[PDB]
Every structure is written in C-alpha cells, then in structure tokens.
Amino acid sequence: SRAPDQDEIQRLPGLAKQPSFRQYSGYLKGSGSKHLHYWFVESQKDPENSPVVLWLNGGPGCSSLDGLLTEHGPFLVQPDGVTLEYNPYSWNLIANVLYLESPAGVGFSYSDDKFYATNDTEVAQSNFEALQDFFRLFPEYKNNKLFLTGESYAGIYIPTLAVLVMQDPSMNLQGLAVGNGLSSYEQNDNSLVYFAYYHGLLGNRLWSSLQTHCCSQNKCNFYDNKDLECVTNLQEVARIVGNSGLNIYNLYAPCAGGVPSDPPCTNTTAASTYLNNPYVRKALNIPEQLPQWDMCNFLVNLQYRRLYRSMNSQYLKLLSSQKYQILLYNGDVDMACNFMGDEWFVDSLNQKMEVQRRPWLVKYGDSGEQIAGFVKEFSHIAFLTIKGAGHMVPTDKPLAAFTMFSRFLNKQPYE
Template sequence: MSAGHARAAPVEPPEPRQARQGGRVRLDALEGSPLQAPGRALTISRFLQMPPLLAAASPPPLLLLLLFCCAAQAAPSGHEVTYLPGLAKQPAFKHYSGYLDAESDKHLHYWFVEAQGNGAADKPLVLWLNGGPGCSSIAGLLTEHGPFTIQPDGSTLGYNNYAWNKLAHILYLESPVGVGYSYSDSQDYRTNDTEVARVNYLALKEFLRLYPEYSSKDLFLTGESYGGIYIPTLAQWVMQDPSLNLKGIAVGNGLSSYETNDNSLVYFAYYHGLLGSRLWSDLQASCCSGGKCNFHDNKNLNCTLGMAEVIRIVDESGLNIYNLYAPCAGGVPGSYRYSDGMLVSYDLGNNFIRQPLRSSWREFLLTLPVASNKARLDPPCINTSSPTTYMNDPQVRKALHVKDNAPEWQMCSFPVSRGYKRIYMTMNDQYLKLLGSMKYRVLIYNGDVDMACNFLGDEWFVDSLRQKVQVARRPWIYTDENGQDQIGGFVKEYTNISFLTVKGAGHMVPSDRPRPAFNMFQRFITGQPF
C-alpha cells in the first residue's frame, strides 16, 4: 500500500444475476448492461419483444432481420483507422481506435487490432494492459508485441514480424482513466485497485457492445508489471459474467506479491554480483532469523540501514532496473530532476514500499505542490521520446480519433501514479479462485534479468499457491531464425497454471526476446504444452 493512504476495504465483484430464462438470454440481466443508455443490440432486442400496437404497423420481418444483423456485426462508425501516419504501406488487417465510455464521465481510449493472416476469423480475443500503475498500454503496442513498431525518429513505423495479432485479435486499453488519452470529465484521477478492476470490466463490456461479433470468442486477459494486480482483479469480475467466454490469463513480469518481490530481489541482487559480501553478511545477521529472511518490512534498525544501502544500489545507482544487462537510456538518472520547468520523476514505487527510505520518498511526492501539467513520470532507463513524439503528432491524433480536449500523451501518468491507492499486497486469493474453478489456463512468465518484478519472486509466489505439479522444472525449447532448437528459458507446470522464464529477457519480454516470446504466447493461447 502506498505511503500516506489508508487501507480501503476491497470491493468484490457482485454475483451475476440470472441471465438465461426459459432458454432465452435476458440482455437486461447481463452484468454491465447499459440499461440507462442502451446500445443498438439491446434497443432492437427490446423492440422485438414489444407487443405490436397495430398489426399493419409491424415492419416486414426481413427489415427486422437486416436491422439486427447490422447491429450484431458492424463495427462502430468513425472508429476504424483508415490511414495511419508513418507506415510505408497500410495494413491488410483492420484496426480501430476511439473511446469506451465505461461510465458517463470516464472515457477510456483504446486501440484494437484485428488478427492478421489465415484463419483470422477463428482466432481469440485478447485484452492487453501495461502496468505502472499509470503507464499506457499503447507502449505495449508500439514497443513490444503490436503489429506496428515505432522507429527511433518518432515519425515512422515498421511492421513487427513477431506481432501477437498474428495469433489473436488484441485490444490495447489505456487504463486507468488519466493514462495516455483516457480522461475523466471531472479530471479527478485518484483511484485504487478495486476501482480500476471495476472500470476495466465496464470498458470491456462496452467494447463488446460496440463490437458484438467478438462477444462469443474465446477471451484471454493479459498484462505486464502492475498488470500483475490489474489482470487477476479484473478476472474476478469477468469469470462471474456468463456472457463472457473467459479462457485464461497471462501475466508477464507481474507484481504478484510485494513481500515475495522484495525478499527475492535482495537474493537476486546478491547472486548477480550487485551486493558485496560485507553487506550480505550484515543483512543476514540483522534481517534473518531461523533460516528465514524478512527484507520486506523488517523493523530491526540495522536491517533498515542495510536495506537503505540495497535500495541505493538496486534502484538509484544507475543500473537499468528493467534489464540488468542493458544500458540505461539517457545515462544515470536520479530519483527525479527538473527539466524546462517540469518535474520529471523516475520512480513507479513498486519495490520496498515498506522500507523507510522508500516510504519517505512517496510522502515527499504526495506533498509536492505541482500542477499535473508541470510533472511527468518516466520509467527509469527507458527512452520514451519516440512513442511520445509519434502519439502527439496532430495527424496521428486525428487518425486515432483522439478527442480534441484530450491531454498530451505521455507513456506514464504522474497524477495517476501519485494518486493511486494500492489495496492488495498479494494476489494469492485471486489466483486461488481462478484455479479453484478448474476452468482457466494461467501463465505467469518472467524475463530472467528483470529487477522490477524479478523471476524468483514470481516463482516463489506460484509455489506458494500449492498446486499439484504436473511437469517438473525443465528447459523449454523454441526454434530460432536458422531453424535450430534453442533453450527459451525454464518452465514448471502445475494443474492449470504454468510458471515460465524467458532467458535473457528483462521486464518487457517481447521487446527483448521477440521470437521466443511469440512462441510462448502461441503455445499459451492454443493450449499446447511448453
């Protein structure tokens, strides 16, 4: 939980109302039905159920059929992207961009890319959420696994040979409200874990209202980083909605538990040569007892002092926290800087939040009297200039149907991050509910050189769920560009859940290791063994 915030009681998704009666689907009983502002399909359904006032006034049956077909198959007018600046050649597949009005005052921007290639009509629907909290999922599209890859000049796009939309229709949603081009009429961007899950669920329902032809498709919820919170909490809503065909979830380098993430990171740092033997001995003496170490919230003074040194090395020395072996774009950053009258913060606030050094920094951020347009949040060691330049191009905004009053696009939102309440400290209960149903495939995958959400912490977390092991930890194989088998990483498979590492990848796995990442994703959504 962020410093300075009281713990709020989690809001659990409601039990679904009975949506089927007498062999018919009651549209008004489905979760998220827009009863006060019904869409086309719901309006026509109600019209069809009304008794005729005059037999002569009844429209011809063929006309009704045509009306219903149009409502059920047509994408929303004005959302299709007919020309995307920066591409040498426009794509053969369709893609759409616009707003999903999750509530009357909450407008979430999305970019939806249809599947490409043979058999596209039979491919599943995938929702993708980047993390933060407060970072845009468009980063996932333009820099990780989308069909278009931003080039260093910030004005041209290339095609991604390992685009995940070769395997699925993918919805990239800018969430929470306040991220990217998403906005609220009130401009109040304070939010929390449970509110984000609820609004994301409503946005997904609104998407399927606008694109009803996708409502019966297999659905997968996927995300990265703080998506480790977003995705399981959203799944609690989706799994209770009988109108949604949820098949599974996948989380990459996710924050699954603050405690295991913190405790494992210290081990990761020591065994990767970042901590000297003196510091390690001091930590063992002051933070550990009975063979168990608590680096997460230990109150021992000597442990606190040792952990302050760990934080300075891991987070503040200039190492790339997202990829230990990659250079830091822009050189060694501090925790923040001022640039052209703007405060630029580099701290997303996910590691060691219970340590005094980290919590005092969060308190400092919360008390800063800075206007939202005078502050920026940049992920450390990541060059955000290319996607930022591209997304703020007036022609790109027009092509993506961005509202004129939408703010300037930034990869991460300082107001959202600063005002975010972290309610859940672990996703244990959420995963156990998913696994207890025995209906869903679950994948937790990690690049093995990431320090933001390290592989060891997520492996410990999966082990703590105490599921039955089906396949012991072993290497998994993919075929490289030369047709040779290579080790992609390691995998351990349990009943309905798999933990997998990607060798040589950091926090953004598809960016660092696109080919094995594509192979992994393909096996996951098709249900093939790793």
C-alpha cells in the same frame, strides 16, 4: 460490419504499407464519467474465429499503447519517432488484440470531471465495464475465446479483473497471462535482495549486514522488517538496484542518458514523439482538447491507492473452477518484478499435477533449437522464465515471446 465505423483507423501516419487487417481506435465507457482509450487490432489470420486478447500495461499509470508500439503490436515505432515498421512477431498475427489505456487519465484516456485518484477495486470495476462496452461496440466478438493479459502492475489488474469476468457467463473467458507481474509485494521484495547479491551487485560486507539485521536462522525478512539497521541496509540495496545507474528493467542493458549525477534509465521519446503528432491523434480519433500523451501519468501513480498485498486469493479463486489456463512469465534479467518472486508465488499456490521443471525451446532458424527459458507446470497454471529478457519480454526476446504466446493461446505444452 457490426463494428463502430466512427472508430476505424483509415490511414495511420508513418506506415509505408497499408495493413491487411482492420484496426480501430476510440473510447470504452468505464465507471462514472471515465472514458478509456482503446486501440483494437484484428487478427492478421481469420479475425472472425481468432481469440480476443486484452493487453494491459502497468505502472500504475502507464499506457498499454507502449505495449503496442514498443513490445508486441503489429508495427513498432522507430528511433525517429515518425516511422512505423511491421512486426513479424506481432501478437495480432494469431489474435484480435485489444490495447486499453487504463485507468482514466492514462495516455489518451480521460474523465469528464478530470479526477484521476483511484484504487485497485475501482480500476477492476472500471476495466470490467469497459470490457462490457467493447462487447456492445463489437458484438461479433462476444462468443470468441477471451484471454486477459498484461505486464508489471497488471499482475494486480489482470487477476482482479479476471475474478469479475469469471462471474459474467456472457464473456467467454479461457485464460490469463501476466508478464513480469507484481503478484506479492513480500515475495518480490524478499527475492529481489537474493537476486541482487547473486547477480554480483552487493558486496560480502553488505550481505553479512543484511543477514545479521534482517534474518533469523534459515529465514530472511526483507519485506516488512522493523529493525532500523535492516531498513538502512535495504535502503542501500534499493539505491544500488534502482538509483545508481543500473537499468532496473534489464540488468545487462545500458542506462539511457548514462549514469546519473520517464523512470530512471528509460527513454520514451520515440513513442511520445509519434503519439503526440497532431495527424496521428486525428488518425486515432483522439479529441483535440485532451492533454499531451505520456508513457506514464505521474499524477495517476502519485494518487493511486494500492489495496491488495497478494494475488494468492484471486489466483486460487480463478483455479477453483478449472475452466481457465493461467500463465505467469518473467524475463530473468528484470529487477523490477524479478522471476524468482513469481516462481515462488506460483509454487506457493500448491496446485495438483506438479510436473518436473524443464527447459522450453524456440527454433532460431539456421541457429537451431535454443533454450528460451524454463517452465514449471501444474494443473491449469505454469510459470515460465524468458532467458536473457528484461521487464518487457516481447521487446527483448520477440520470437520467444510470440512462441510462448502461441503455445498459451492454443493450450499447448510450453516445451
């Protein structure tokens, strides 16, 4: 219709059945000379009236296409790195999902000058301009309910972008959701040390040393403590947590490649094998001159200048209007952006209409209703845990993730 015909995905390799929905792959113009690769998957049910949902993966420097192919896209890449299988828990069953590779240099995204050194403020402005370009390319979606969603470092990307979107009346912003998100370095660092001890990863001798060198009375500082022995003890905590063979993204999952002598314990071979196939790149309208696809761009991460230490001000600004529904959800077995840091963060916002913490349920067919996690609700904001899920909630618990997503989009209770 008004959509760009040039960006249409005709026949995607590895799919045994043709999609019932239209899908597009092309470029959105960011700031300066930045060209951000998008993959837009229309809703499987009523795309014309379904909400538009932006999805951003974190890093910084990691690809949102991993969110499509391994987390909640319409089809997921199989271990052969060739076959795609339909996802019965796809977020596009009820939404027009826009997967954006951002910032420039991530995956198939690029710049004419190839200068990928960026920062939080530049990324937010470039994402805003890319969203404006999306609405110029797909004007039929301008009035649809808009939701901004993401994972991990997108805990910074999403609220900063939402603050820019809020100032634009033409965008129908209705809410935002952040999965295992970085909301406060201080809250994340402090909660992680407690998480590690209480999940049986630190011994009583190390815990005693941490209490004596990092703490004073009933308050611990595991964030910016200057005490030299506290720093040494925290280096040991960091070694046990992420550099000893434990999977930082899911404590109870195995470490891909085994305990050492792609980030540690992960394996991105399937998605990389699929996206690096020349026929897949052609099907996705990727210019031939672009370098190989990687799940995370090491150089974007290395050159990235982190600016914000907390999203407290951003969330308070977004809640001030009382126009948006906010969700922070965390898999409770993740150690990268643990659930407690985000629960502490949401509680610290001190919002009105505080509800008692309750379990939230998911029906698992014949197995009946099961506790999928816990919900702590306030006016216009809720914090949720996903019991037994790691860093990538839709990968570990796809039915619970879809159920939560459906309740979020429809502004329904999470219970």
